[PDB]
Design a protein around this ligand. Structure first.
Ligand SMILES: *[C@@H]1O[C@H](CO)[C@@H](O)[C@H](O)[C@H]1NC(C)=O
Ligand SMILES: *[C@@H]1O[C@H](CO)[C@@H](O)[C@H](O)[C@H]1NC(C)=O
Ligand SMILES: *[C@@H]1O[C@H](CO)[C@@H](O)[C@H](O)[C@H]1NC(C)=O
Ligand SMILES: *[C@@H]1O[C@H](CO)[C@@H](O)[C@H](O)[C@H]1NC(C)=O
Ligand SMILES: *[C@@H]1O[C@H](CO)[C@@H](O)[C@H](O)[C@H]1NC(C)=O
Ligand SMILES: *[C@@H]1O[C@H](CO)[C@@H](O)[C@H](O)[C@H]1NC(C)=O
Ligand SMILES: *[C@@H]1O[C@H](CO)[C@@H](O)[C@H](O)[C@H]1NC(C)=O
Ligand SMILES: *[C@@H]1O[C@H](CO)[C@@H](O)[C@H](O)[C@H]1NC(C)=O
Lengths: 12, 595
């Protein structure tokens, strides 16, 4: 299954 | 007769099931023909298969035992298929294998315990499968292993401490399983390790102090687990670290001042933890830093002035803390700043004039602080600006002219500030502005006459500002779908050419001083669903045609001076409260029958 990579993508 | 290489390949053809295109060309005519076959590379002398590539051929089924006869195979790639069943132990008899990649399949059950027989294995990639049970301790015996990927499955338990003894390991990836317990300190013994990706698991405890011995580590990620306690101070000794992701955990305490020693750090993300205290002023020395993220912690105090002159800083995220004081007045001067979000803090003072020094700033989010003073004219020359959210501050003065000239400006929220005087007329001429909220200010002025000629512009609100005078004619009101003008002092009549707003869906003109009649053209609007014209001085009838406007779900005209019968059709099924406080209005709907 897919797994997140990189910095936290949260945004305003 | 037939070479075992040929028969072994043909076994694969018949053991795996895919589309006809999968093995079309694996054809035997009427010697060493298999060397022309796609995915097959042979030793040019002996004709044996040394590399076999069946990646991304839409295959399913199981690996047949006959694969063991491909005995001088070095490279094997089965990735991006639908292979199932337990991992096939016959692969362990391919004892010359240097590269084995089975990523992106559906292999399941426990991982079989025979992999040490693959003595010369350099690269092992099993990313994204269905394995479960314990992580195979067996892989500990692979003394030449350089790259190990076991992520994206459902492996449980702890990380075998024995993995510490993989003396030539450079890359390890175990992210996205159900691993738990404490990270074994023995992993700090991996001298040549450069990449450690192990988050999206359930690890508890801290990060082992002996991890500070991974002198070669360039990339470290243990985000989205259950780590807690203080950040380990000793991680300062890691002078090659380029990437540090520790977000979405439960660390507490202060950020160690020793992290100022991470001179090659580029990305730092401590989002969503429970850190407190102040950003270490030693962060001013992290000159390679490009992405600084501390979203959603319990941080406080002032941002060190020096983070405003980090030369490489591109992305600055501090929202959802409680920082105080002003923004470093030189922030932006590096010519490199692209996106910045410091919303929901307690910042004071002015917005620095240099935020956009190199035309790279595209996202500026400032909302919910206590920024004050005038809005910097320099933002009106921020050529690259796209999204600007600065609502809920104390920004005062006239909103400057200039924003109409920015080709990519598309979202502007300046609501709930303390702005005065004219709204800029050039807002009506900005080429791609889609959202513009000016609600809750103190203009004491008319709308710009040209307002409704905004080409793209879908949502426009200026409710509860202090708007006066009359609503401009709705000339070509091209892409609007939401208009909010409640709670002002608008007078005169609703413009009768409102029918130009073909895309309109919600319209709130309530709580003004509008008079005259309801414009008939509202009936010709294709998609209108919400109308609120309550608390005004409107007179006249509600046009009968409104009853055949199939799309209307809300039509609040309460507290007016309308008269005549409430229409019937759609209007038969609406809330009676929409029609109250209108002495002259009548109809079965509202309980006062007609005549
Ligand atoms: C296996 O094949 C895929 C698809 O061609 C490729 O992208 C991947 O890097 C290969 N794996 C190895 C270990 O070379
Ligand atoms: C590495 O760096 C810091 C510098 O303050 C030092 O004090 C710390 O004890 C070192 N880590 C260890 C325990 O080896
Ligand atoms: C604002 O930030 C605080 C942390 O200081 C947080 O607790 C709160 O939820 C944030 N506001 C929201 C709900 O966005
Ligand atoms: C944030 O800091 C200010 C200054 O002390 C304080 O008055 C305010 O209440 C703080 N907010 C929170 C979330 O504690
Ligand atoms: C405008 O801004 C966004 C975000 O930077 C970008 O994806 C888009 O392509 C830009 N378009 C133009 C005209 O530069
Ligand atoms: C405009 O801003 C006001 C006040 O900030 C807010 O409450 C409202 O939801 C916004 N309107 C729209 C359409 O986003
Ligand atoms: C609306 O208010 C202004 C301000 O006094 C007044 O001069 C003007 O005549 C009014 N317009 C209408 C149509 O009543
Ligand atoms: C119109 O605005 C008033 C004032 O905020 C509000 O109470 C009502 O929910 C709004 N109605 C619609 C349909 O937007």
């Amino acid at each position: 299954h897919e797994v997140p990579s990189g910095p936290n993508p949260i945004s305003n | 007769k037939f070479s075992p290489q040929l028969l072994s390949l043909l076994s694969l053809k018949t053991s795996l099931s895919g589309p006809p295109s999968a093995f079309q060309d694996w054809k035997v005519p009427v010697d060493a023909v298999w060397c022309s076959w796609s995915g097959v590379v042979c030793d040019n002398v002996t004709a044996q298969v040394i590399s076999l590539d069946l990646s991304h051929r839409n295959l399913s089924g199981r690996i047949p035992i006959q694969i063991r006869y491909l005995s001088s195979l070095l490279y094997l790639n089965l990735s991006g298929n639908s292979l199932e069943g337990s991992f096939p132990t016959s692969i362990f008899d391919l004892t010359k294998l240097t590269t084995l990649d089975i990523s992106r399949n559906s292999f399941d059950s426990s991982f079989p315990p025979g992999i040490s027989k693959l003595k010369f294995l350099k690269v092992f990639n099993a990313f994204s499968n269905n394995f479960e049970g314990l992580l195979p301790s067996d892989v500990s015996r692979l003394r030449f292993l350089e790259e190990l990927n076991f992520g994206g499955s459902y492996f449980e338990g702890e990380i075998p401490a024995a993995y510490g003894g993989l003396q030539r390991l450079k890359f390890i990836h175990l992210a996205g399983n159900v691993l738990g317990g404490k990270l074994p300190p023995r992993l700090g013994l991996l001298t040549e390790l450069q990449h450690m990706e192990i988050g999206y698991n359930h690890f508890n405890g801290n990060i082992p102090s002996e991890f500070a011995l991974l002198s070669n580590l360039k990339y470290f990620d243990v985000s989205n687990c259950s780590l807690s306690g203080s950040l380990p101070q000793e991680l300062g000794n890691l002078s090659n670290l380029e990437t540090l992701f520790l977000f979405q955990n439960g660390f507490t305490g202060e950020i160690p001042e020793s992290y100022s020693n991470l001179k090659s750090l580029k990305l730092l993300d401590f989002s969503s933890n429970q850190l407190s205290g102040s950003i270490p002023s030693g962060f001013s020395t992290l000159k390679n830093l490009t992405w600084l993220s501390l979203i959603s912690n319990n941080l406080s105090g002032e941002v060190p002035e020096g983070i405003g002159e980090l030369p490489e800083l591109t992305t600055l995220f501090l929202w959802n803390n409680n920082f105080t004081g002003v923004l470093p007045h030189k922030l932006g001067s590096n010519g490199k700043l692209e996106t910045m979000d410091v919303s929901n803090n307690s910042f004071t003072g002015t917005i620095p004039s240099s935020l956009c020094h190199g035309n790279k700033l595209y996202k500026l989010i400032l909302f919910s602080n206590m920024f004050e003073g005038e809005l910097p004219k320099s933002l009106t020359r921020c050529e690259s600006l796209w999204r600007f959210r600065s609502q809920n501050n104390r920004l005062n003065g006239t909103i400057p002219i200039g924003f109409g000239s920015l080709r990519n400006l598309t979202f502007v929220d300046l609501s709930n500030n303390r702005f005065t005087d004219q709204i800029p007329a050039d807002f009506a001429t900005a080429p791609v502005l889609q959202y513009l909220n000016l609600s809750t200010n103190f203009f004491h002025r008319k709308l710009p006459e040209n307002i409704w000629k905004a080409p793209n512009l879908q949502i426009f609100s200026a409710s509860f500002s202090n708007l006066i005078g009359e609503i401009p004619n709705y000339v070509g009101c091209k892409s609007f779908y939401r208009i909010e003008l409640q709670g002002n002092s608008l007078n005169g009549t609703i413009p009768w050419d409102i029918g130009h707003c073909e895309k309109l869906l919600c319209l709130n003109l309530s709580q003004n001083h509008l008079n005259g009649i309801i414009p008939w053209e509202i009936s010709t609007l294709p998609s209108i669903a919400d109308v609120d014209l309550s608390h005004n001085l409107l007179t006249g009838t509600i046009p009968s045609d409104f009853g055949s406007s199939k799309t209307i779900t809300t039509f609040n005209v309460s507290y007016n001076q309308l008269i005549g019968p409430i229409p019937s059709g759609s209007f038969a099924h609406l809330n009676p409260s929409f029609f109250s406080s209108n002495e002259g209005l009548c109809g079965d709907l509202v309980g006062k029958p007609c005549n």
